[PDB]
Design an enzyme around this catalytic site. Sequence first.
Site, PDB file in Angstrom:
ATOM      1  N   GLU A  97       0.769  -1.217   0.000  1.00 51.68           N
ATOM      2  CA  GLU A  97       0.000   0.000   0.000  1.00 51.68           C
ATOM      3  C   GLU A  97       0.816   1.290   0.000  1.00 51.68           C
ATOM      4  O   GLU A  97       0.300   2.330  -0.366  1.00 51.68           O
ATOM      5  CB  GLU A  97      -0.928   0.040   1.233  1.00 51.68           C
ATOM      6  CG  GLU A  97      -1.880  -1.132   1.241  1.00 51.68           C
ATOM      7  CD  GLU A  97      -3.006  -0.949   0.250  1.00 51.68           C
ATOM      8  OE1 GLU A  97      -3.004   0.229  -0.314  1.00 51.68           O
ATOM      9  OE2 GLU A  97      -3.814  -1.790   0.004  1.00 51.68           O
ATOM     10  N   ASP A 144      -6.598   6.648  -4.723  1.00 49.16           N
ATOM     11  CA  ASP A 144      -6.147   5.292  -4.854  1.00 49.16           C
ATOM     12  C   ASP A 144      -6.209   4.782  -6.294  1.00 49.16           C
ATOM     13  O   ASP A 144      -6.508   5.534  -7.220  1.00 49.16           O
ATOM     14  CB  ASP A 144      -6.771   4.376  -3.797  1.00 49.16           C
ATOM     15  CG  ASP A 144      -8.138   3.853  -4.077  1.00 49.16           C
ATOM     16  OD1 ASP A 144      -8.665   4.360  -5.129  1.00 49.16           O
ATOM     17  OD2 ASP A 144      -8.691   3.014  -3.393  1.00 49.16           O
ATOM     18  N   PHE A 186      -8.210  -6.592   3.435  1.00 46.98           N
ATOM     19  CA  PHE A 186      -7.840  -5.212   3.684  1.00 46.98           C
ATOM     20  C   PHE A 186      -8.045  -4.361   2.428  1.00 46.98           C
ATOM     21  O   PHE A 186      -8.419  -3.208   2.470  1.00 46.98           O
ATOM     22  CB  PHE A 186      -6.356  -5.162   4.049  1.00 46.98           C
ATOM     23  CG  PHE A 186      -5.849  -3.788   4.412  1.00 46.98           C
ATOM     24  CD1 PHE A 186      -5.469  -2.886   3.423  1.00 46.98           C
ATOM     25  CD2 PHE A 186      -5.676  -3.425   5.747  1.00 46.98           C
ATOM     26  CE1 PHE A 186      -4.968  -1.633   3.785  1.00 46.98           C
ATOM     27  CE2 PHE A 186      -5.148  -2.193   6.127  1.00 46.98           C
ATOM     28  CZ  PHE A 186      -4.795  -1.288   5.127  1.00 46.98           C
TER      29      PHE A 186
END
Length: 162
Positions: A11, A20, A104
């Site tokens: 990430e 993102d 996640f």
Amino acid sequence: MNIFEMLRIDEGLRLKIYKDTEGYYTIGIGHLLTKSPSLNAAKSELDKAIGRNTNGVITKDEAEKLFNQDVDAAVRGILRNAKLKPVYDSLDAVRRAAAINMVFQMGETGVAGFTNSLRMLQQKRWDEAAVNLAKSRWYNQTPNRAKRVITTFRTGTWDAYK
Ligand SMILES: [Cl-]
Ligand SMILES: [Cl-]
């Protein structure tokens, strides 16, 4: 290697609001703030999450704090999910980290829809699951990260991350 270091690699860490891969307002270590197009809605959620007026910027500690909470929530989401739990329980410690990573990233619902791959993991048919996992939007959109996670499920080692 452990779940934290793994996700930190997948990430990155960003201390100012960013978009993102899907175009959503995110901050820190992959902390989704909102799917709304508004930078203000994102700014609002951010302040609400940190407990202060941040102007769109947080410190490293704040980032880590969000991160700790998100990993925790991810695990708990898996453990509360009737479809996920059993698969997760059947796995070894490395593979469990791969499972956490998927959740996640894509949410528990998201993962929950990979029914066929889930069954394959549960049965320990590694190569097969790896192949099935690749037939997905997930793989097509974020192929390098997907490949990393998939290799982890396939081998049961942290080699993709080394
Ligand atoms: Cl939050
Ligand atoms: Cl990628």
